Amino acid sequence: KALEFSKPAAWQNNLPLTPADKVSGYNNFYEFGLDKADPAANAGSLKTDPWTLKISGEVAKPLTLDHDDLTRRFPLEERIYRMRCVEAWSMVVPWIGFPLHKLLALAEPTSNAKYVAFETIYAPEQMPGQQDRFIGGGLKYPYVEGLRLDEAMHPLTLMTVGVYGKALPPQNGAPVRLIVPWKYGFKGIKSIVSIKLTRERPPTTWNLAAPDEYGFYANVNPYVDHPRWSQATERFIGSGRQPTLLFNGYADQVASLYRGLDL
Ligand SMILES: Nc1nc2c(c(=O)[nH]1)N[C@@H]1C(S)=C(S)[C@@H](COP(=O)(O)O)O[C@H]1N2
Ligand SMILES: [W+6]
Numbered sequence: 001k002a003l004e005f006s007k008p009a010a011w012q013n014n015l016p017l018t019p020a021d022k023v024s025g026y027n028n029f030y031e032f033g034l035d036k037a038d039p040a041a042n043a044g045s046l047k048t049d050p051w052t053l054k055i056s057g058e059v060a061k062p063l064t065l066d067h068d069d070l071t072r073r074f075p076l077e078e079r080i081y082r083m084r085c086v087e088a089w090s091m092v093v094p095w096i097g098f099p100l101h102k103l104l105a106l107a108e109p110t111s112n113a114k115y116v117a118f119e120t121i122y123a124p125e126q127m128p129g130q131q132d133r134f135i136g137g138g139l140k141y142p143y144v145e146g147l148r149l150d151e152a153m154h155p156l157t158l159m160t161v162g163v164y165g166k167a168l169p170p171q172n173g174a175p176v177r178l179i180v181p182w183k184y185g186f187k188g189i190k191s192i193v194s195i196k197l198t199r200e201r202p203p204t205t206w207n208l209a210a211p212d213e214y215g216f217y218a219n220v221n222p223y224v225d226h227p228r229w230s231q232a233t234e235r236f237i238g239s240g241r242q243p244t245l246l247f248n249g250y251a252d253q254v255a256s257l258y259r260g261l262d263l
Contacts, residue, residue: 003096023164118144139209158180
């Protein structure tokens with residue numbers, strides 16, 4: 001479904017784009033199966049409209065948004081970001097959405113709020129992966145993720161509601177999905193149902209599944225490898241190899257957040 005959005009020059013560029021059919025044909029969405037083609041083939045069984053997105057926790061004005069809100073409450077913008085999955089493949093995608101800080105501003109987070117916890121919809125009857133230990137990759141469902149508050153407020157982190165000029169296909173995490181371009185793809189949680197501001201660091205699906213391989217921060221870094229493969233290089237998914245950049249190329253926009261700190 002086509003939709004209206006602006007094209008801020010800050011997020012417009014000359015990066016060669018990943019074809020739309022690959023953006024929505026090569027996916028990781030375990031709730032619909034482990035294979036890259038499983039989501040495009042099975043995600044159609046998920047009902048994305050009506051939708052309820054609930055903002056709560058250490059917030060002063062907890063609110064809830066319906067499906068129409070996702071595309072009208074805030075002005076939409078197209079941003080051409082690179083998307084680097086931890087498995088060493090990457091894409092350049094023209095997402096569409098609104099910065100997460102505009103949403104958090106409405107809820108007005110309290111002085112105790114330190115982290116943001118996200119949760120994906122739970123519908124075992126529409127999601128085959130939520131029923132088979134191997135089909136769903138053995139992940140503890142529903143999928144959960146979190147960000148430190150300053151990360152969630154960064155102007156780069158996007159609440160994504162569409163791609164390539166149109167609403168998001170279900171395989172891409174329709175109707176609302178998270179995108180943090182400087183981190184590995186698993187941080188970009190799909191089909192969000194809940195956003196909670198918390199005082200402590202929330203749990204993370206992949207870090208719970210393998211604490212030794214997937215960290216909480218997961219910043220794209222070519223110098224720190226994955227226990228089972230190097231992160232120095234990556235397969236660009238174009239039509240039909242390149243070195244991985246620090247923070248996936250947004251180092252000068254995000255380095256500030258991590259200077260002088262550990263992990
Ligand atoms: N709910 C949910 N969100 C998710 C996943 C998932 O399996 N379930 N996998 C992802 C991982 S590991 C990647 S690399 C990206 C992929 O987004 P895309 O399919 O739209 O490219 O989504 C992340 N978000
Ligand atoms: W990934």
